[PDB]
Amino acid sequence: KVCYFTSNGITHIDYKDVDLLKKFVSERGKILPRRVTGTNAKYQRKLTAAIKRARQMALLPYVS
Amino acid sequence: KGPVAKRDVLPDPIYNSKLVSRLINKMMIDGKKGKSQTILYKSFDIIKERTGNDAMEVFEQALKNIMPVLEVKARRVGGANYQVPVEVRPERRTTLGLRWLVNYARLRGEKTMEERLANEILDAANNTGAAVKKREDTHKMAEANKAFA
Amino acid sequence: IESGIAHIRSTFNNTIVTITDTHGNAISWSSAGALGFRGSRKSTPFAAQMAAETAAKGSIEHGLKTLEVTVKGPGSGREAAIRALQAAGLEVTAIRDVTPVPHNGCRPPKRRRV
RNA sequence: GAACUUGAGUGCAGAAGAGGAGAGUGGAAUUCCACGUGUAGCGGUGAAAUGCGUAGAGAUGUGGAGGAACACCAGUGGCGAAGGCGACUCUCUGGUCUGUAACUGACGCUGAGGAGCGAAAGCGUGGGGAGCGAACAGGAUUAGAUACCCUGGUAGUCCACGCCGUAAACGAUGAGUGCUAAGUGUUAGGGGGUUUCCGCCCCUUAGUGCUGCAGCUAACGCAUUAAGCACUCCGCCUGGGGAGUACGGUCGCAAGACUGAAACUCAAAGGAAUUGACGGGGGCCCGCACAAGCGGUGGAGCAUGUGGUUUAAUUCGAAGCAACGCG
């Protein structure tokens, strides 16, 4: 596929962007892997850091 | 390898049936179709006499009571010795019916196998009888082991 | 009552079905061992079907009709038990595939052949 | 002694990382606790039994306690000298890589001895204990079963500091440097050729995979991440056993570690590969081999042959299938 963050040029993912993180997160609550969303390695690292921080502030779920 | 099949002869000069000659070939001891034909026709003449009916329909009713739907085969996995129930294909239904008629008739004990086969058909007609113990018990073994199918 | 949730927990030994009420109050329960199967037949989906049939009969005896069925535990008889809740006069609307997933937690007991 | 900037290092600029140490916090799940639902099982196995359970369990709903590991990300991905390091957040802190040109100007490499780190188990002291779990107990299995299996469960696993100082501590491959075809993924960078982009291509680093030429090798294989071609330095080997033993010494609370023989004994031990045979390894297939049936043998009587034993001789030969109504 195509990477999101290379396309839209956007850098540090800004945990407040709950809708974008909600796009990358799967239906139950898990982080989708890199071969599903198509991102880079680096951007998947910043994505998973963002999702874990937004989970601990209940901006994102853990289990559904 | 593959499956091989066999044949059988169509008529009987009285009682024109395939399966009655199939019973003639059954219960043949030591290569004597003559004795089994004599036993069979004297038995069916008793079935025509003792009950005022044609013995063809009584004989098919006895078959219908005996023909088993469900054999229970074997399946040993590990140390388990499970028996597995099999839907019987109808050729083996007829032939297990004939074996149970013949075996439990000659196992009964009366003053000819003429009389034993006649009374075993008369018992298997009104279903309660000696071979139908084996029919019921095979269906009970399939009923108990139905968890495997 | 009319609505409840059917908790099926089918594991490699037993397939236990408890039909409970929505804020968790068990109306009736029956297992694969309650039906009479004592051996390994407890694991077979025929026993899970039978256990769902008896739990469904008890639930209709108390009167509930529309379930919301939660499959729990790794076994074999989950699909037949969902199907047998349908064929016994009930409705299975939602299917909650909820086996208890630890994230990392406690360590499991040792592997078997060692 | 004077000069140089490539090696080395400082400066500036970014980048990435489970690099470390201290504190705080989270969400599953597990156990336990209290209460409601409710009834007869649960658990477990190849099969069961011990356990748990009508004194109300397992299931289920809510609440609480407490400990430990951090699903998905997650990847021949990253970092570290190695051990190793996966939740999150901050505090302090180590290293690396990339672009140079500002500086230094050989400041470098290696390193016995020394000093340190050093998985896991173990030890000391104090806490901690949810799961697991040596030991131990019960149940099974079995000829036996101090085992595998099952049910329980102590130390330990966890934390603080101190000791041990060992691993198949592995890449079974010392460190440094230079040279010696390619193809190909990928990680963190840089620059270029159109486009502001998306992005394609080209180019270059440092790390990380695979296939591969020359070359090497006993072969397997390695091959720019060398096991090639060289130079420097260190460590280590000289048949197998005895034996990493004994003695001595050092270190250690201990367990032990390190150093380390000899008498005696053998003509082998060993590596890699080849042909077979075998496997309670995988695949395919076949045969009265199995199943599906039918009739028997094993029981009785006799016929017959053979072992023993009686014998003057009980002639000799056959001896699992493949001897025994055989010569």
Swiss-Prot record, chain A:
Instruction: Report which residue ranges the record marks as coiled coil.
Output: none
Q: Which GO terms describe its molecular function?
A: small ribosomal subunit rRNA binding; structural constituent of ribosome
Q: Which UniProt keywords apply?
A: Ribonucleoprotein, Ribosomal protein, RNA-binding, rRNA-binding
Q: What induces it?
A: Strongly expressed during exponential growth, decreases 2-4-fold in stationary phase, part of the rpsF-ssbA-rpsR operon. The operon is induced by DNA damage by mitomycin C.
Domain of life (superkingdom) = Bacteria
**GO annotation, cellular component aspect:** cytosolic small ribosomal subunit
What's an example Gene Ontology biological process for this entry? Answer: translation
Its quaternary structure? Part of the 30S ribosomal subunit. Forms a tight heterodimer with protein bS6.
Similarity comment = Belongs to the bacterial ribosomal protein bS18 family.
Q: Give the protein's function.
A: Binds as a heterodimer with protein bS6 to the central domain of the 16S rRNA, where it helps stabilize the platform of the 30S subunit.
Q: What is this protein called?
A: Small ribosomal subunit protein bS18
Provide the species name: Bacillus subtilis (strain 168)
Counting on the full-length protein, the chain here runs from 14 to 77 of 79
From Swiss-Prot, chain B:
The biological processes this protein is annotated with in GO are:
ribosomal small subunit assembly; translation
Q: Which of UniProt's keywords are assigned here? A: Ribonucleoprotein, Ribosomal protein, RNA-binding, rRNA-binding, tRNA-binding
The GO terms this record gives for MF are: mRNA binding; rRNA binding; structural constituent of ribosome; tRNA binding
Q: InterPro entries in the record, alphabetically?
A: Ribosomal_uS7, Ribosomal_uS7_bac/org-type, Ribosomal_uS7_CS, Ribosomal_uS7_dom, Ribosomal_uS7_dom_sf
The organism's superkingdom is given as Bacteria
PROSITE patterns xref list: RIBOSOMAL_S7
Q: Gene Ontology terms, cellular component aspect? A: cytosolic small ribosomal subunit; ribosome
RNA-binding: present as a keyword of the record?
yes
**UniProt-listed Pfam families:** Ribosomal_S7
Instruction: Supply the HAMAP family for this chain.
Output: Ribosomal_uS7_B (MF_00480_B)
Described by its record, this protein's role is as follows:
One of the primary rRNA binding proteins, it binds directly to 16S rRNA where it nucleates assembly of the head domain of the 30S subunit. Is located at the subunit interface close to the decoding center, probably blocks exit of the E-site tRNA.
Q: How does it assemble?
A: Part of the 30S ribosomal subunit. Contacts proteins S9 and S11. Interacts with VmlR.
Please name the PANTHER family in this protein's record: RIBOSOMAL PROTEIN S7 (PTHR11205)
Q: Which family does it belong to?
A: Belongs to the universal ribosomal protein uS7 family.
What is the protein name given in its UniProt record?
Answer: Small ribosomal subunit protein uS7
Q: Which organism is it from?
A: Bacillus subtilis (strain 168)
Curated annotation (Swiss-Prot), chain C:
What is one Gene Ontology biological process annotated in the Swiss-Prot or TrEMBL record? translation
Which SUPFAM superfamilies would you find in this protein's record?
A: Translational machinery components
Q: Which domain of life is it from?
A: Bacteria
Summarizing the function annotation, the protein's role is: Located on the platform of the 30S subunit, it bridges several disparate RNA helices of the 16S rRNA. Forms part of the Shine-Dalgarno cleft in the 70S ribosome.
* SUBUNIT field: Part of the 30S ribosomal subunit. Interacts with proteins S7 and S18. Binds to IF-3. Interacts with VmlR. Interacts with BrxC.
Family of this protein: Belongs to the universal ribosomal protein uS11 family.
This protein is called: Small ribosomal subunit protein uS11
